[PDB]
């Protein structure tokens, strides 16, 4: 029932998103749980892509969404370089 993130070379964590606030503080989190600190929180200045995974096992961008409807779909989360995104 809880939420795996994961990103290349890192080992995968596992989270219960109905703890966060909403997005700032989700980011702030996950720039902490994996060594990344800063380079989430800001995604204009921000390499990396946040991204999750959605029914029919669509790849969205995270944030687009409310909220609330964010925590009702989402199944899994994946923080992607630049490279992972070139490659799909």
């Known amino acids: 029932t809880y939420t795996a993130v994961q990103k290349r070379g890192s080992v995968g964590r596992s989270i219960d998103v109905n703890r966060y606030r ?8 996950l720039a902490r749980m994996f060594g990344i600190e800063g380079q989430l929180e800001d995604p204009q200045t921000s390499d990396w892509k946040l991204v999750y995974v959605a029914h029919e096992n669509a790849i969205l961008l995270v944030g687009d969404d409310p909220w609330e409807e964010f925590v009702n779909c989402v199944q899994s989360i994946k923080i992607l370089s630049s490279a992972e995104v070139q490659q799909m």
């Open 22 to 29: 909403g997005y700032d503080e989700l980011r702030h989190d």
